[PDB]
Design a protein around this ligand. Sequence first.
Ligand code: NAD
Ligand code: NAD
Ligand code: ZN
Ligand code: ZN
Ligand code: ZN
Ligand code: ZN
Lengths: 374, 374
Amino acid sequence: STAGKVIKCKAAVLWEVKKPFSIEDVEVAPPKAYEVRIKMVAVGICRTDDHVVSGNLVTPLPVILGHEAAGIVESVGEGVTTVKPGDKVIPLFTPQCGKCRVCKNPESNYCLKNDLGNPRGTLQDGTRRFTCRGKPIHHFLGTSTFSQYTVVDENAVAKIDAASPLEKVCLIGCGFSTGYGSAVNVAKVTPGSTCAVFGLGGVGLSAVMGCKAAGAARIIAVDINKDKFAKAKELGATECINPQDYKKPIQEVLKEMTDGGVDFSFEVIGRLDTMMASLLCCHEACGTSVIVGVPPASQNLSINPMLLLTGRTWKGAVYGGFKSKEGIPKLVADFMAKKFSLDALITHVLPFEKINEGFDLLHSGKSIRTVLTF
Amino acid sequence: STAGKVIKCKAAVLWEVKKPFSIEDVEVAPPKAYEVRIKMVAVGICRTDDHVVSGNLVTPLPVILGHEAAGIVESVGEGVTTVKPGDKVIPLFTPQCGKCRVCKNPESNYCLKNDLGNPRGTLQDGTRRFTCRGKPIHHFLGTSTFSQYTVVDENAVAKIDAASPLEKVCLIGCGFSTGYGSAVNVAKVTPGSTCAVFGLGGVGLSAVMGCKAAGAARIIAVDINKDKFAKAKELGATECINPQDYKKPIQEVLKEMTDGGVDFSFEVIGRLDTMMASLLCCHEACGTSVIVGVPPASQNLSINPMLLLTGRTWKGAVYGGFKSKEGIPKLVADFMAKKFSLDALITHVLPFEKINEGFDLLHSGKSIRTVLTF
Ligand SMILES: NC(=O)c1ccc[n+]([C@@H]2O[C@H](COP(=O)([O-])OP(=O)(O)OC[C@H]3O[C@@H](n4cnc5c(N)ncnc54)[C@H](O)[C@@H]3O)[C@@H](O)[C@H]2O)c1
Ligand SMILES: NC(=O)c1ccc[n+]([C@@H]2O[C@H](COP(=O)([O-])OP(=O)(O)OC[C@H]3O[C@@H](n4cnc5c(N)ncnc54)[C@H](O)[C@@H]3O)[C@@H](O)[C@H]2O)c1
Ligand SMILES: [Zn+2]
Ligand SMILES: [Zn+2]
Ligand SMILES: [Zn+2]
Ligand SMILES: [Zn+2]
């Protein structure tokens, strides 16, 4: 039995920046009140995990990363009512406490219970459930899914269809939802509109899917890696261009391709140069630009306010505007009904033990999404 | 008669920056096809005209400024069909050609025929109708209203109720429409929301009026000049604050007064610091900040994209988002129908020949709007 007891299992621990993960033997404390301990089944490799490794995203170390996943509830702490042992679930990197100003506001989703703005690397009560070799290990985004077992706050856990193919839907835990929603919830792409998507990783490609579903007439995919183009077109890109092929700035090229600029531009990479280009490429009077990629720590853009005064709308969001706990299940039901597929996004499958190899592929540009199995 | 002939009249010419205006005899050529010659009756003094004087906004010189006004049609060139001699009309600093991409888009108003983005100081055909001392004189925003007679493009002239009090309705040509519309069309203030308004000039007080109309439960007026607070309250502000009274940055004060920041913030001054503070005071997850004020030439804001990634919406606009030709007449009709008064905004009245005195008043801070009568 394991309920009420400390769990000993394997987890991928990051001891320091710019080093490989080390698969360690770790101890996982039982769930406290309003906490859920989950046996992990599958985890997707997202660039945000990698940002911590590269030092581009700050969070307290040592730590167990991982936030895009699906598992089975092993046990629940006292007070828990939304999930029970055996349920299939998806941890949410941005919770939905349902009690703060944001959660009450129908237009926002950045729950105040988050651990993104100023990471503590703990659960909501401010403590850690992880220990390894006599040392406490930090949580990441309240989820830490690069571990056979993890403890997450209830409001950061969603119950999903029991028949769910956990090795597929784990992408709904982050990449798909974020990309797709940035188009449908955040930007609010209108039918017959023109869009531009910067970055064709699992998130950017989902953004491409979102634009198509919203009914865009033109979806121009932009990426410096041409091997991402077939998938982009497969998912709805009407055009694919590579900035490296041109002599003039990419924003000028884009504007000249769309009568002054696209209606909706999305930055889905995490760089300042492309965030700028993306803003500059949407029409100065009727364009909307959405920041989706996480920028490098404290890096600042330099913009002339005039760019906005003409009529531009510049926004950003996490999770594609989806209120995590309510949105994830609906999205899974949609997947189950075949409204959309994630096959094209899953390029590689590897056992959790080969996690480092999973990151190598991300670094190589050969993978879109590598799903790890436990 | 003057029809078909060159008009000799008085006009306020600016031959160089940071110098007073020069009331001189100027010649006004007859209107070309699709152009409208107007006998000016009243013009409000807007900070945008002053920007040119101070060097803060560049436009070719010599020039005749003036863009917030109301007059009577003297004559129309061939092809003109929307106005006739004797009609009361309001010139528009942003046109509504009705045929370009922007005009066709229901949600945009920055017509491509504008002369703001990259000033030529001419009418839409690239030439000028003014001459003075044997030399041509430039137009400003296609209106040039600091003149007894001015010629404007038809799509930049709106016909209004024949019983309209021109000495009041003139404000509807810029400041009132911009400020009010910024709240009602650009920000789309929701009932029961919280707002912050930086700048309590004629445009800012109009923003306050806009927020009240939209049903804001809370409207915080921000200004370093406490003499504006009486009018702010009179116009709808629930509280007024002067940054000079605090040790902490204003955005921090604003956030702490409003549970993490207001739902809507407006910058109606034209400064980087206030523009930054304004963006920072809207709630990180559900706030919207709108740029109304025009920033000094080529100055840039340094911004961390993370301010947007949490959920903030940053936007700007001209004319309060109103499609000028359709919008202005309806606002005049609302005024006629007593829906809103403009008396609180007009604090001084002077004849056109004392234009320099009205600007002195603007600089001194003793006036909201000074109206010049011809
Ligand atoms: N807002 C959110 O909630 C949220 C959620 C998930 C991920 N993200 C962020 O999304 C971003 C992308 O995520 P991913 O997992 O899909 O990343 P990814 O690395 O798999 O793919 C990004 C793409 O950008 C392309 N690219 C890189 N540099 C380029 C450049 N200079 N110009 C043009 N293209 C270039 C790459 O070739 C790659 O195809 C990351 O920054 C991640 O942090 C945000
Ligand atoms: N977007 C547009 O279409 C549009 C239209 C009209 C005017 N504008 C611009 O809007 C802005 C305001 O116009 P106005 O005519 O009402 O100007 P104004 O000079 O009369 O009013 C500015 C107000 O802001 C206050 N203020 C100045 N500096 C401040 C500071 N550092 N901190 C706090 N408060 C400060 C001033 O005391 C004054 O009360 C200007 O930039 C003008 O060019 C834009
Ligand atoms: Zn992610
Ligand atoms: Zn919440
Ligand atoms: Zn137009
Ligand atoms: Zn003005």
